[PDB]
Amino acid sequence: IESSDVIRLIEQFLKESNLHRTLAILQEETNVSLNTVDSIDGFCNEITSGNWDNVLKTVQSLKLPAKKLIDLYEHVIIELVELRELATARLVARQTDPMILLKQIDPDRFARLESLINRPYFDGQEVYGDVSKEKRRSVIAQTLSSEVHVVAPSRLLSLLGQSLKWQLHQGL
Amino acid sequence: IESSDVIRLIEQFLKESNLHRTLAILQEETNVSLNTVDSIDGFCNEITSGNWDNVLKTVQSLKLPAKKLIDLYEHVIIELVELRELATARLVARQTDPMILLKQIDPDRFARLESLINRPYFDGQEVYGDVSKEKRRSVIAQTLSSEVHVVAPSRLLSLLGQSLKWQLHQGLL
Numbered sequence: 001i002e003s004s005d006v007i008r009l010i011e012q013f014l015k016e017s018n019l020h021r022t023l024a025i026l027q028e029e030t031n032v033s034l035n036t037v038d039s040i041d042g043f044c045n046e047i048t049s050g051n052w053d054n055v056l057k058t059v060q061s062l063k064l065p066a067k068k069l070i071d072l073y074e075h076v077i078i079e080l081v082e083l084r085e086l087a088t089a090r091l092v093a094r095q096t097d098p099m100i101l102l103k104q105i106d107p108d109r110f111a112r113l114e115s116l117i118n119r120p121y122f123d124g125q126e127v128y129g130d131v132s133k134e135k136r137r138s139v140i141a142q143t144l145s146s147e148v149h150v151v152a153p154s155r156l157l158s159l160l161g162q163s164l165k166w167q168l169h170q171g172l
Numbered sequence: 173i174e175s176s177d178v179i180r181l182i183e184q185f186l187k188e189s190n191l192h193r194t195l196a197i198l199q200e201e202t203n204v205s206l207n208t209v210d211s212i213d214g215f216c217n218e219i220t221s222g223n224w225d226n227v228l229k230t231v232q233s234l235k236l237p238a239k240k241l242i243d244l245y246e247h248v249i250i251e252l253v254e255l256r257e258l259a260t261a262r263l264v265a266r267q268t269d270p271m272i273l274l275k276q277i278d279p280d281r282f283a284r285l286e287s288l289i290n291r292p293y294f295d296g297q298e299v300y301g302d303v304s305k306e307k308r309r310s311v312i313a314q315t316l317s318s319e320v321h322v323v324a325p326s327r328l329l330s331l332l333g334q335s336l337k338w339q340l341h342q343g344l345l
Contacts, residue, residue, distance in 0.1 A: 002332055009332075010182055017173075021201050026194045159335040160178065166338040 007032045009156040016154060035062055036151045043148055044141040052076045059144075068147055069098040072140050077113060079133075082122045089117050179204050181328040188326060207234055210325075212317045219313035220306075224248045231316070240319050241270040244312050246285060251305075254294050261289045 007026070011034050014023040027033045037043045037058070046054045056076065059069055073096055080089035093099050093113065103110040116127070124133070131139075152158070179202050186195040187206075199205050209215050209230070218226045228248070231241060245268055252261040265271045265285060275282040288299070300308075324330065 001329060006185070006329070006332065010185070013178070013182070017175075019198070019201050022194060022198045025197045026191070029191055029193050157175070157178070159332055162338040162343075163331040163334040166334040166341070169338075169341070 004030075004032050008034065009159070012036070012151065012154070013156045033061075033063070035149060037062070037148045038150070040145050040148060040150055044145050047072070047141040047144065048137055050079060050137065052079065062148060064144075064147060066098040066101040068144070070102050072144065073098040074102065074109075074113060075136055075140055078116065078127065078136075081117050081119075082124065082127075084122070086117060093117065173202070176204055180206055180208075181331070184208075184323070185326070185328045205233065208323045209234075209320055210322075212320065212322060215320060216313040216317050219244075219316065220309050222251060222309065224251070234320060236316075236319060238270040238273045240316065242274050244316065245270040246274070246281075247308055247312055249285060249289070250299065250308075253289050253291075254296070254299075256294065258289060265289065 007030050011023060011026060011032070014020070014026065015034065043055075043058065046058070055072070059072070073092060077089045077092050077099075080086075080092065093110075099110070102113075116122075128136075179198065183195060183198060183204075183206055186192075186198065215230065218230065227244070231244065245264065249261050249264050249271070252258075252264065265282075271282070271285075274285075303311075
């Protein structure tokens, strides 16, 4: 007899079958969720390409702990103030779990982030001078790549295929 | 939308796992439902007890052909006229598919049924005299029980168990 593992098998099946509605209700009702990404490349690429809305939604979906996300969320804010999305930058700084944590453990570091947001303009030559934008994005992607797990596609159907092969064998 | 049997495997699992919320959404989103019954006993008891609303709903779920339902729907009408629910009795005889089929195929039998419906009173001695009320219910239950197939509980888990047995056979490498 298998346990919660059956549910994750089903969840993967639902995602690949585009049954996202059923997938949503299942995760809520069972208190079990997919801890997987389609590919490590694809996940890291989003960070490398700077598509922050995608990576933020993704990491929150995987429910990674706040401590691992502190570097990522800090950089997201730096790029947001760079794009002069000050309202959004402040929003990330005020409401998100990693930033609330950052304030608690390293208030000095949070304070520097506070000052960066409040500067009359963003000078990338000053901010990125020690370590470039590309390097910061690359480092965050590398560390996070070990924190996400990929599973083989269609695990449920593969297992069911094995069931059929067993039955053909056992029929003899 | 390709694996309709797989969805039903999942649906049964959801039902046995008390995930009724997920089960409802799955049926709605996929537009497929279980065509199986948990047990003939539950099915036969519903017919024996005369819970026709349930039996009609169950039989409608299984998408049984009208001919097998002709005897059942006829008996329902007989019990309706027994309770002197003539308006409902006339309604069922004219509007439901099995009775409409009955008129086309066996108008004499249908005529006898309408004659029964239009009678000033219900004579239990004639109707149940030849074959009793309880016996008629048992016969219909017996015939319909054979027209429905039962599936083993927890089929998904059983198949997954076979997957592991296969892996023990060839998966270890």
